[PDB]
Structures are given as C-alpha cells and as structure tokens.
C-alpha cells in the first residue's frame, strides 16, 4: 500500500556524490535468501530491478549498510525538542494506540534521489522506491508524511488527540468507549486511504498500552525495566542498537551514556563483523543495568493544578528534586549531580539545579514550576547582594528540610582592628617547578617554606594557607595575587583543589577574616619584604 | 517587484540554530501571529528538508522576534547599496531624537527566492507532542540586515520631500528604526514627527561621561592608602601620566592595615596632581569605523551597574553608570537587560552600531529569563563573563 502523498525532495550534501561500495560475496544460502526476499519487495513495489549502468551501490548482507549513503545525504531538520515524557500526557477517558505497520515501506521516496539507493545481490541489481530502513531521511520524511495525512482527519475531529512517535499513534479522546471505538474506526480507514495499514494486532483491550514503552494505565503511566542483553556474538550494529535502548531510556533513567563503548563505533568496519572492548565496554553495561533495573512511573498532568518542584541536598554535589501536583502523586522525580566550577557553593549549585528544572518543565509541561527549596530567604538575599554576578531564582519559597543550605563562612568587608596582618606571597621557577611560600607580619612572625612541583598560583595559595594556619580566629591577610583572591572572594564551599579545600576548612574555623590585595612589585610595605624572602 | 539578489558571505552556509523551549503561552501567541502572516502570504510552510533554522520568540510590549543574529553574521555585508549611508553625527548633538518603527514597510518588497530557505524558523510544541510548525519568509523579514539596505532607496524617495521640507531634522535609519532628531521645542518637535509620520503613513545632548575621582579622606589607614595605590596603578594603563610612588612611600614598613598614616606633601602633591589628570581626556580615543564596539557591564549592588564601551582596551570611547532603582522590580536579569538595551541605543545614536556585550552572568541564567524583559525590535550580540575587581576599580 504505497502512499499517494507527495514526495519530500532530498539532496546529497553539496560537493558529494552518491555512494559506490563493493558487496562481499555472501554464502550460497544467504544469497538465495536475499533474492527470495528482494523479489517480493519488488512485487510489493517497495524496490525495483535496474540496469548495471547506475554507478552507485551499497552493501546488503543476510542475517543494508547505508552508512555511506547517509554520510553524503542532505542533513534534514529534525523538528522536535526531544522525546515526549509520559508525565506530560493529560488524563483521557478513551485512548487507543494504533501501531501503523510497515509505515516506512508505505511512504514513497523522491524519484531523483532513488538512483543513490541502489544495491546488488551477488549480480541482481535493485533500487528502492520507498523510504529505506537505514536511510537517514526515513524518520524525518516519515514524520512529515504522517502529519500531512493526519491533518485532514484532525481538522475534522478536534476532540481527538493524536500523538505520533514513530510507528505508534496514541489516539486519545475523552469519549464514550462506544463513540471512541467509532472514531478509531474512521481514523483507521483514513490511514488506509493513504496506504497506511494499521494491523488488527493493536491495543483493543489492555489498559497498559505501550505507547513509546510507557505503559499507559488510566491514572498511572509506567515504564517496564529495560532488559539489556549481552550475547556471545556482540555484532557492530548490535552495539549500535544497544546504544539506542540506553539512550531512549536515558530521558527518564538518570545517566547511562555508554560513551566509551561509543568509542568502539569511532572506528567502524563491516556491519556484520564482531568487535568487543576492554573494561570500558564490559563495565559500562553493568552500571547502566543497575539503573535500568528499578522501574519508574508517575501520574498524568493536570492543566489546572499547579506544578511544584522540590529539591533536596541529598549529599555532596548531588541533589534530588521532584516535580508533582499532588503530594504523593508526582510526575518526575530526579537527581542532579553537578558542580559547575572548580570551586562552587551550595547556594550556587542550588540555583543551577533550579534552572535545570525550570526549562525541563517548560519543555514538558509548558510552564515554570513553583519551588520548595532547602534555603532560607535571608540566606539567598545576603548571597546575591554579596556576589559580583547577577543571579535569580523564580518561584522561590522556603521549606525547612533537614539538610539545609547556608553560606558556610563570609569575609570581612573591612579590616579587623588588632588582627595580626599577614603579608603573603609565594613563587616558583617555571623551569624547575619548585618554589617557596611564606610571609611576614605586623608582629614579627616570619615563616617561609620550600616547595616541590608547583606553579606560582599554587605557591600564592600555599602562602595564603600558611598565614591562615599560623594565625588566630581574627586575621587580616594580604596578597600580590588576584587568582587566589578571586577563588576566596567567591566563598567556595568545596573544590577539586585540595589546597583550596584546606584553605576553606580554615576559613570556616576562623572567626573573622579579611583578605586584601596589593599591586605586586610596587614598594608596598611588607610586600617588598615577603617578596624577597621567597626569591632565591 | 523584481527581487534584489542578496547572498551569504563567501564560504558560509545559512544558519542552523536550535530553538529554545517556549512557554505554552508564547507559543500559542506565535501560532496565531504566523497563521495570519501565512494567509497574508508573507511566510509559507516549509519542510524538514530545509536544514536551516533561526530561533523565534514572543516579546511583548505580542510580537514575533526572530533571533536573526546568525543569518545576519552570515549575510553579505552591505556597502554597494550603502546600508544607512553616512552616520549623522548630528544625532549625538540634537535636543531630541525620537525612534520610529519603519519596520513594517519591509513586508512589501519580495525577498530573493534563492535566499528564502535561509530564513527558515520553527515554532516549538509542548512536551514535543507535535512536529514543529516550520516556515520561510517571502518578504524582507523584520530583523534582517539585508532588509533595510535593500529597501534603502524606497525609503530615501519617501523621506526626501519631508527632509527637504525641513532642512534641519536629522533622520538616521538603523535596522527597523528611524532615529528622527531635532532641536526644536518639544511641541514643535512632535509636529515634525507627525508630518514625517503621515509621509510614512502613505535627548542625546544630556548624555555624560564618568570622571574617575579618588576619595575624600583624612582617616587614611594603611590599606586606605593601599587601596588608592592599587587603583592609581591600574588607572595608569589609561592615563600614562598618573603615578603612585610618594604614596607607596607612606606605606613603607610592615604596618598593621588599621594603622593610621600622615598624608605628607609627598602624597598631598601626588593625589591632587593625579586628581587633575583623571578628568583630562585620554588623547588616544578614536572611534575607528572598522573595529567593533565592546561593552562591559559590572554589577554595583545598589541596583546600579557600570559599563564601558571600547574598541581597544583602555581606550574607552565612553563610560557610564545605569542605576535602575527597582525597589521591588529587582530581577537582576530584568535590570542587566534593561542595561543592555539602554547601552545599545546610546551607541546606535553615537557610533551607529550596537556594541557586543560581555555580560556578567551565567549563560544558563541569562538564557532562561532574558526574553521575559526584552522589549526591543533588535538583539545585540553577547558573551557571558565573570567580572574581576573592576567593581571597586570604578564605582
Ligand atoms: Mg606574586
């Protein structure tokens, strides 16, 4: 049933010409099979025999390697921000999921591009007439076709809601199971007048409809845990499709990216060849599994009840949040591990988590949720005022949860009277990567320290550290370095930098600190002194 | 009419920008705005096979706003058909400039067919429950660089009468705007605008720079001097004559920061002498028409902000301070935005170009709210950054 829809005009990437690849001769058996097969696609109209003139060719195997053709195909414009989240679905009275079958083979390929789709049978020579299976266009062209076709039936049935996602048509409508049945009939026939045949093996009873792998019960959508095999013959394409499953779940299941397995795909070869990988490969699947094991689910959406996001600092650099509408009936829960900076703050990370969640909703629900955050209104207010950059949170609202967020410490706006003033400085020879770090003081103390394999930044920090250690609860300290000044000025909660962490531990312990800065090399008092002490 | 052929800059392809998520509201808004333009035939639905895309959004003074910044960077410069011919220079000086939205004119002139693909834009769908609606302009689009220059002549013929009719009212066209400046009294100004307005229907002189000044002290502690010293050090990069030395001399020791210190004639001479030069023009300032303008904004906490426009570092073409006292309307984002918008209009009226901004904010943040406050027909280029101690260095 090849659809009568107009064809989307496809081009090759400018500067390129269609593929030309040799077919590795297959086994007598394989060949006799591919023919057997090709002959009926030829019968169904899906493909067709062609003369040995057509320069181009792409490999068939018997278990089409479209890699090349795709590498030279006009990259299209995928028209979707992402896959739809089940929580985004509103609750409907009547719902059916028509799996449009064979949908690719039904939708015809542009004539003037068909040339490129030729393939031979070790030979017999064919060329497609319809969206090929592996071809790059297929999905994007199929979606465009599917929509042009639904449009008509849609202007006609505003009550009905059709969501497409590949070969699956979620048709929902708040209707009498009777009248719905009828609409589904009608619809089912429209498709037919367009060659789109919808098999009888559909959804006809079961409340757990599987639209996109989301079991759609009337009040609870769920996702059956994704099984992820590990066969003997771990074939290339298998490795690719494997990626798919993972990647698909990923928009629910938190982090799974088999990125290092993906590296195995960064050195492609025959699609039929088997090719494993080290601990990278082996271990990646496992960590993925762990996550894939525990199922997920949530309620549907109400376009009349508020969205509420609630985040909680469930640990160092990992946060959690849930977006719900009804106390124990949440849509999406989520974890958010991140630390955007080498030195961040909980206040700072909270904000990041907020903004993630904000858009994430705007994508799914279409509006920004209202928050319940582990941070006191005055703690925020002080922090933004004490920060050089501009910031902002939306529907902020305090919720006294157990782990709370606070600015662990703060520096003094003005120098402490009666605090031993530490003049600090460090240095290191670029060549040797060795340096000293020390100080001098208004009293008389004067430390200096030998150092191995560091940078001048590291010394300038070591030096602040020392003066912090060798001092009391209140201390004025002074650097010839904006680097260290900056890190500290930013009130870093934690860091990748141990020394910075060290420097922080002290900072939370002291009682009053005032870090100041002076122009290096000017005869600024005390400075010229520590300057000489660290020089060799 | 026969379309003016325009083409992308050498060896650059059209734009291919992803669309930002839109609120179930701005979307709806757009959706109707487009369905009409479609009916009027100014746009037209296109397919997935047009690999290009520019983002759109709903500003609201609803208005469709296409973020053409890319297609503009990729558009051939205009210089044959001299885009907005010489910059007035008069504008800078007039008693009153007023800006008009000549933009809707553009929707008449037909756009070169072999160029339409490059304006493709896509209206997003909630939860991605629907393929986006994609379109392609069929007329000079609103924010395109190509538009105005192409329509340059039509406009010129249109104003010529009224211009020769009032030989001294400067009219500068920039993008979709018309900066009509005059020195007439406010009332007698407005008439001229209205006269100019029928035709189409067919206060810089107060701007002021920032004089850097050192504090007024007596309670000079050690760091009070250390402070001064540090600044005057950096200030030299701007005024090579300023020099701290007699000041550093006061500091010589290992004095506790709190120690008070006697400002001797050594320094008394230097401060006063320096105070002079901080108000004397850096003769090196030059606005070079071939260099970009850069704007830097610092946050000053009191709902105040500081900015400097410069082409080459330390050669400030202008410096300033916006203080948007928002007792309740304190959305830094909203402020910073308003800052941004007020600084680019100043530059359009002066250098005749929108500076490229270095925003003191996180991309993410700036990216999630900016549109909520943006009110302009245009959108300057911007780069996110982290301001160092300049806050102090000039406030
Ligand atoms: Mg140093």
A 58-87 → B contacts, CB under 8 A:
74-85
| Contact residues, A window 240-279, toward B, CB-based 8 Å cutoff | none
Do both B111 and B228 map to the same domain? no
Q: In what order do the strands lie in the sheet with A329-337?
A: A329-337, A318-326, A308-312, A370-372
Cβ-contact A435, A451 below 8 angstroms? yes
Q: Is B47 on the interface with A (CB under 8 A)?
A: yes
Method by which this entry was solved: X-ray
Contacts of B229 in chain A (CB under 8 A): 518-519, 522, 524
For residues A207-220, b (16+ Cβ closer than 10 Å) or e, as one string?
Answer: eebebbbbbbeeee
Shared domain check, B257 and B133: no
Instruction: Tell whether A350 and A442 lie within a shared domain.
Output: no
Same domain flag for A297 and A336: no
Strand partners, B61: none
Final resolution, Å: 3.2
State whether A328 and A451 are in the same domain: no
Query: Do both B23 and B133 map to the same domain?
Result: yes
* Residue A356, both tokens: 């993630």
CA atoms within 13 A on the CB side of A461: 19
Q: Are residues B5 and B126 in the same domain?
A: yes
Residue B303 Rama label (left phi>0; alpha psi -120 to 50; beta): left
Q: Hey, what are A353's tokens? A: 């988590």
Tokens 């068909």 — which residue?
A114
d(CA B142, CA B37): 13
Which residue's structure tokens are 């487009």? B34
Q: Could you list the residue range(s) of the whole structural domain that residue A489 is in?
A: 409-536
B240 lies in the same domain as B368: no
Q: What's B171's domain CATH number?
A: 3.30.70.270
**Which candidate, A395, A408, A405, A398, places its Cα nearest to that of A368?**
A395
Task: Return the beta strands (E) in chain B as ranges.
Answer: 56-59, 63-66, 96-101, 121-123, 133-135, 170-174, 177-182, 294-299, 304-310, 316-323, 356-360, 382-385
Query: Tokens for A30?
Result: 């394989």
B183's CB contacts (< 8 A; 6+ apart) are: B94, B95, B96, B168
Q: Looking at B287, B319, B346, which one is the last position of a domain?
A: B287
Calculate how far, in angstroms, residue A471's C-alpha sits from the geometric centre of ligand 1.
21
Interval between CA A515 and ligand 1 midpoint (Å): 15
Q: State how far residue A290 is from chain B, nearest Cα, in angstroms.
A: 28
CA-to-CA distance for A496 and B191, rounded, in angstroms?
65
Q: Which strands sit side by side in the sheet containing A168-173, from one edge to the other?
A: A94-99, A168-173, A161-165
- Taking the C-alpha atoms of residue A165 and residue A144, their distance in angstroms, rounded to an integer, is 12
- The annotation places the binding site of B at 101, 176-177
Kindly identify which residue of chain B lies nearest to residue A340, measuring between CA atoms: B362
CATH of the domain at A386: 3.30.70.270
In angstroms, the CA B156 to CA B162 distance is: 10
Domain that holds residue B95: 90-106+148-179
Other CB atoms within 10 Å distance of the CB of residue B280:
10
Beta bridge partner(s), residue B53: B16
Minimal Cβ distance to B21: which of A363, A440, A486: A363
Listing DSSP states for B274-298 in one string gives HHHHTTS--TT----TTS--EEEEE
- Integer Cα distance of A467 and A423 in angstroms: 8
Are A330 and A459 found together in one domain?
A: no
- Alpha helices in A99-219, H assignment, sequence order: 103-106, 111-114, 138-156, 177-192
Q: What CATH number does the domain containing A112 carry?
A: 3.10.10.10
Residue B130: partners with Cβ closer than 8 Å, 6 or more residues away: A163
Structure letter (DSSP) for residue B24: H
> How many C-beta neighbours within 10 Å does residue B263 have?
18
Q: Are residues A449 and A501 in the same domain?
A: yes
> Structural domain tally of chain B?
4
- Counting the structural domains of chain A, the total is 5
Q: How many CA atoms lie within 13 A of A535 on its CB side?
A: 7
Flag if B389 and A77 touch (Cβ within 8 Å). no
Pairwise CA distance, residues A103 & A107, whole Å? 7
Domain boundary among the residues A301, A330, A357 is at A301
Domain final residue pick, A179, A207, A235 = A207
Does residue B265 share a domain with residue B217?
A: yes
Partners of B24 on chain A (C-beta within 8 Å) are 365-367
- Sign of the Cα pseudo-torsion (B376, B382, B385, B387, in order): negative
Give chain B's length.
Answer: 395
Last residue of a domain, one of A349, A382, A408: A408
Q: Using a CB-CB distance cutoff of 8 angstroms, which residues of chain B are in contact with residue A389?
A: 299, 360-362, 386-387
Name which of A109, A107, A149 is nearest A2 in CA terms. Answer: A107
Compute the Cα dihedral for A148, A149, A155, A161 and give only its sign: negative
């Amino acid at each position: 049933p090849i659809s009568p829809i107009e064809t989307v005009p496809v081009k090759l990437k400018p500067g390129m010409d269609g593929p030309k690849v040799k077919q590795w001769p297959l086994t007598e058996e394989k060949i006799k099979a591919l023919v057997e097969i090709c002959t009926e696609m030829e019968k169904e109209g899906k493909i067709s025999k062609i003369g040995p003139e057509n320069p181009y060719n792409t490999p068939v195997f018997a278990i089409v390697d479209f890699r090349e053709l795709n590498k030279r195909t006009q990259d299209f414009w995928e028209v979707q921000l992402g896959i739809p989240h089940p929580a985004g679905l509103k609750k409907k009275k009547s719902v059916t999921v028509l799996d449009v079958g064979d949908a690719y083979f039904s939708v015809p390929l542009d004539e003037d591009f068909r040339k490129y789709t030729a393939f031979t049978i070790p030979g017999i020579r064919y060329q497609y007439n319809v969206l090929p299976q592996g071809w790059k266009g297929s999905p994007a062209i199929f979606q465009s076709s599917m929509t042009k076709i639904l449009e008509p039936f849609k202007k006609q049935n505003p009550d009905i809601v059709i969501y497409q996602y590949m070969d699956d048509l979620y048709v929902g409508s708040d209707l009498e199971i009777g009248q719905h049945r009828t609409k589904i009939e009608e619809l089912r026939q429209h498709l037919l007048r367009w060659g789109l045949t919808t098999p009888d093996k559909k959804h006809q009873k079961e409340p757990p409809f599987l639209w996109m792998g989301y079991e759609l019960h009337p009040d609870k959508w769920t996702v059956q845990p994704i099984v992820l095999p590990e066969k003997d013959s771990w074939t290339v394409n298998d490795i690719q499709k494997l990626v798919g499953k993972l990647n698909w779940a990923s928009q629910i299941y938190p982090g799974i990216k088999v990125r290092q397995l993906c590296k195995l795909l960064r050195g492609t070869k025959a699609l039929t060849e088997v090719i494993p990988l080290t601990e990278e490969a082996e271990l990646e699947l496992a960590e993925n599994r762990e996550i894939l094991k525990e199922p997920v689910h949530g309620v549907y959406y109400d376009p009349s009840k508020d969205l509420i996001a609630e985040i909680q600092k469930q640990g160092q650099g990992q946060w959690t949040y849930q977006i719900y509408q009804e106390p124990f009936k949440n849509l999406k829960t989520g974890k958010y591990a991140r630390m955007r900076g080498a030195h961040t703050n909980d206040v700072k990370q909270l904000t990041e988590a907020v903004q993630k969640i904000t858009t994430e909703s705007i994508v799914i629900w279409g509006k920004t949720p209202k928050f319940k955050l582990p941070i006191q209104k005055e703690t925020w207010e002080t922090w933004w005022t004490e920060y050089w950059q501009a910031t902002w949170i939306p529907e902020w609202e305090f919720v006294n949860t157990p782990p709370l967020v606070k600015l662990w410490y703060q520096l003094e706006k003005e120098p402490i009277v009666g605090a031993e003033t530490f003049y600090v400085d460090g240095a290191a020879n670029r060549e040797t990567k060795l340096g000293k770090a020390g100080y001098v003081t208004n009293k008389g103390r004067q430390k200096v320290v030998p150092l191995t394999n560091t940078t001048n930044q590291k010394t300038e920090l070591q030096a602040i550290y020392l003066a912090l250690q060798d001092s009391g609860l209140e201390v004025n300290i002074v650097t010839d370095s904006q680097y260290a000044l900056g890190i500290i000025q930013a009130q870093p909660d934690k860091s990748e930098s141990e020394l910075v962490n060290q420097i922080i531990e002290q900072l939370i312990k002291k009682e009053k600190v005032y870090l100041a800065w002076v122009p290096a090399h000017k005869g600024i008092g005390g400075n010229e002194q520590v300057d000489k002490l660290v020089s060799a | 009419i026969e379309t003016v052929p325009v083409k992308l800059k050498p060896g650059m392809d059209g734009p291919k920008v992803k669309q930002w998520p839109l609120t179930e509201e701005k979307i709806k808004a757009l959706v109707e705005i487009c369905t009409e333009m479609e009916k009027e035939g100014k746009i037209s639905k296109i397919g997935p096979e047009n690999p290009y895309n520019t983002p759109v959004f709903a500003i609201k003074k609803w208005r469709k706003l296409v973020d053409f910044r890319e297609l503009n960077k990729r558009t051939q410069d205009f210089w044959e058909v001299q885009l907005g011919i010489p910059h007035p220079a008069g504008l800078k000086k007039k008693k009153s400039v007023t800006v008009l939205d000549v933009g809707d004119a553009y929707f008449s002139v037909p756009l070169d067919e072999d160029f339409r693909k490059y304006t493709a834009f896509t209206i997003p769908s909630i939860n991605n429950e629907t393929p986006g609606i994609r379109y392609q302009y069929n007329v000079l689009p609103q924010g395109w660089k190509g538009s105005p220059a192409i329509f340059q002549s039509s406009m010129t013929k249109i104003l010529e009468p009224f211009k020769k009719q009032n030989p001294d009212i400067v009219i500068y066209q920039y993008m979709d705007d018309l900066y009509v400046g005059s020195d007439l009294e406010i009332g007698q100004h407005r008439t001229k605008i209205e006269e100019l307005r029928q035709h189409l229907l067919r206060h810089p002189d107060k701007w002021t720079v920032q004089p850097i000044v050192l504090p007024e002290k007596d309670s000079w502690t050690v760091n009070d001097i250390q402070k001064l010293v540090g600044k005057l050090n950096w200030a030299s990069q701007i005024y090579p004559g300023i020099k701290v030395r007699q000041l550093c001399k006061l500091l010589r020791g290992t004095k506790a920061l709190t120690e008070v210190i006697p400002l001797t004639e050594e320094a008394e001479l230097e401060l006063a002498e320096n105070r002079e030069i901080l108000k004397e023009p850096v003769h090196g300032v030059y606005y070079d028409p071939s260099k970009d303008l850069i704007a830097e904004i610092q946050k000053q906490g009191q709902g105040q902000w500081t900015y400097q426009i410069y082409q080459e570092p330390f050669k400030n073409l202008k410096t300033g301070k916006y203080a948007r006292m928002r007792g309740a309307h304190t959305n830094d984002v909203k402020q910073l935005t308003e800052a941004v918008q007020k600084i680019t209009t100043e530059s359009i009226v002066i250098w005749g170009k929108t500076p490229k901004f270095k925003l003191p904010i996180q991309k993410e943040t700036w990216e999630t709210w900016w549109t909520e406050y943006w009110q302009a027909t245009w959108i300057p280029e911007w780069e996110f950054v982290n301001t160092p101690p300049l806050v102090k260095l000039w406030y």
